[PDB]
Ligand binder design. Structure first.
Ligand code: HEM
Length: 291
C-alpha cells in the first residue's frame, strides 16, 4: 500500500498546539486514574499499540489509518486496558473534530511523554482515517513471555535495530502491569509517572527473583516491590542488549536523544510524507507556555 500524509485542511502548527494543550491540561486534571499514576502511561502505550501493528513487508498496519477505532482492533486481547486511554481522548476529539484519529492517538503519546518530563519528540500531522476494512487482524503485537531472540526478531518487522529496541523499551519505566489486562501484576519502577532512565538502573541494580504470579505467569520480582516482564529481563541476558542498557543507565541524556528519534520513527512507520509537507512540529509544554 502507499499511505500518503495529507494535512488536515487549513490547519497549522497553532491548531495542533491547541490539541496538545487540551490533552495536557486534561492530564493535569484527571490525576486520580490508576491510584494516582494519571493517564500518561496508558497513553504512551496507546500510541505504541496503534503503531505496532505495522508490517514492513506489505505496508499494512501502523498508525496511519486510525484503525484502532474499529471493533476488531479495539477488542484485540493485546489491547486490553487501552479502552481507558481511548475514553480519555474522546472528549478531546469531540472538541477538535477536524483531527484524524491516527493523528490524535499519536499526539497523545507525544504529549504524555513531554508532560512527564521526557524529551521533546518531534511530531508530524497527516494521518488519514481509513476504512474498517484496512484494520489489521489481531496477533501483530508482541508477547511478553519470551526472550531476547524473540525481541530482536519481532522488532525487525518494524524496522528497528538493537539500539532502537533498547531505547523504546525504556518506556517501561512508566506505569505498571495489571493482572486483568495482561496476566502480569506490579509497577515497573518507583517514579511511575515521571520519565527518566530509571528502567536501565533498575535492571542493573535490583535483586530480581523469578516468580510465578496469580495468573500463573512468570515475572521477575524485586525486593523494592517492582516487576519486570521476561521480555524486559532478556535485555540483560543478551550481550548486545546489555551494553546498551549500560550506556543508558549511565547517560539519561543519550537515552532521551535515542528514545526521541526512535519514538518518532515508530509513529511514522508506513507513512509517506510528500516533499511539500510541513516539517515536524515541536510542541511547547504547558510549562513552557506558562499554563
Ligand atoms: C516486547 C515489547 C513489549 C511488550 C511484550 C510489552 C508488554 C507490555 C505489557 C504486557 C504491559 C502491561 C499492560 C497492563 O497489564 O495494563 C505493558 C505496559 C506498558 N507498555 Fe509495554 N511492552 C512492550 C513494549 C513497549 C514499548 C515499545 C512501549 C513504548 C515505547 C511500551 C509502553 C508501555 C507502557 C507505558 C505501559 C504501562 C501502561 C499502564 O501503566 O497502563 N511498552 N507492556
Amino acid at each position: 500500500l502507499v499511505h500518503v500524509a495529507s494535512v488536515e485542511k487549513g490547519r497549522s502548527y497553532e491548531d495542533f498546539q491547541k490539541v496538545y494543550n487540551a490533552i495536557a491540561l486534561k492530564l493535569r486534571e484527571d490525576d486520580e486514574y490508576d491510584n494516582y499514576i494519571g493517564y500518561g502511561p496508558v497513553l504512551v502505550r496507546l500510541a505504541w499499540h496503534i503503531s505496532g501493528t505495522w508490517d514492513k513487508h506489505d505496508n499494512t498496519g501502523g498508525s496511519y489509518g486510525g484503525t484502532y477505532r474499529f471493533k476488531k482492533e479495539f477488542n484485540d486481547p493485546s489491547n486490553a486496558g487501552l479502552q481507558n486511554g481511548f475514553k480519555f481522548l474522546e472528549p478531546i476529539h469531540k472538541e477538535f473534530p477536524w483531527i484524524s484519529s491516527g493523528d490524535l492517538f499519536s499526539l497523545g503519546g507525544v504529549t504524555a511523554v513531554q508532560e512527564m518530563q521526557g524529551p521533546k519528540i518531534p511530531w508530524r500531522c497527516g494521518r488519514v482515517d481509513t476504512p474498517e476494512d484496512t484494520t489489521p487482524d489481531n496477533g501483530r503485537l508482541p508477547d511478553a513471555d519470551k526472550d531476547a531472540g524473540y525481541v530482536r526478531t519481532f522488532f525487525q518487522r518494524l524496522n528497528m535495530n538493537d539500539r532502537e529496541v533498547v531505547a523504546l523499551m525504556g518506556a517501561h519505566a512508566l506505569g505498571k502491569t495489571h493482572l486483568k489486562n495482561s496476566g502480569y501484576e506490579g509497577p515497573f519502577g518507583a517514579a511511575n509517572n515521571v520519565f527518566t532512565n530509571e528502567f536501565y538502573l533498575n535492571l542493573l541494580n535490583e535483586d530480581w527473583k523469578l516468580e510465578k504470579n496469580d495468573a500463573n505467569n512468570e515475572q521477575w520480582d524485586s525486593k523494592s516491590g517492582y516487576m519486570m516482564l521476561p521480555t524486559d529481563y532478556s535485555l540483560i541476558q543478551d550481550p548486545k542488549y546489555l551494553s546498551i542498557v549500560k550506556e543508558y543507565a549511565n547517560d539519561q541524556d543519550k537515552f532521551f536523544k535515542d528514545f526521541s528519534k526512535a519514538f518518532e520513527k515508530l509513529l511514522e512507520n508506513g507513512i509517506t510524507f510528500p516533499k511539500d509537507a510541513p516539517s515536524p512540529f515541536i510542541f511547547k509544554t504547558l510549562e513552557e507556555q506558562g499554563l
